[PDB]
């Protein structure tokens, strides 16, 4: 060890960060009167309805 033959110095680093996300929301707060389309074998009713409103410009 007379010289710096044994003198040693070293550093090392490794950092990793990963992220991920997702969202999906929906809301509906109306009331619509529909009409029966047909009666199924079990008695369930197929209902279809439509409502058109022309407030102004569309």
């Amino acid at each position: 060890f007379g010289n710096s033959r044994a003198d040693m110095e070293a550093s090392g680093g490794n950092s990793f960060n990963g992220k991920g996300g997702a969202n999906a929301s929906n809301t509906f707060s109306g009331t619509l009167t529909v009409t029966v389309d047909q009666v199924l074998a079990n008695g369930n009713l197929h209902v279809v309805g439509e409502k058109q409103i022309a407030i102004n410009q569309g």
């Binding site: 409103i53 407030i55 102004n56 569309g58």
Partner: protein, 58 residues
């Protein structure tokens, strides 16, 4: 006039010449709104700033 006239009824108009009182009290209000948005942002980076002797080729 020789026509018959009830005593206890509310004297509603009944013939062509009869007059009636109308209170307008009309009030209509309609509103409509709609909105939409879509934002996408991406930004990628990669850099050595120091390359090993064995990796200098790539």
């Amino acid at each position: 006039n020789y026509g018959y006239q009830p005593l206890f009824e509310d004297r509603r108009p009944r013939n062509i010449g009869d007059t009636l009182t109308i209170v307008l009290q009309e009030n209509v209000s309609a509103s409509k709104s709609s909105s939409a948005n879509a934002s996408r942002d991406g930004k990628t980076s990669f850099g050595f700033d120091t390359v090993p002797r064995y990796l200098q080729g790539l």
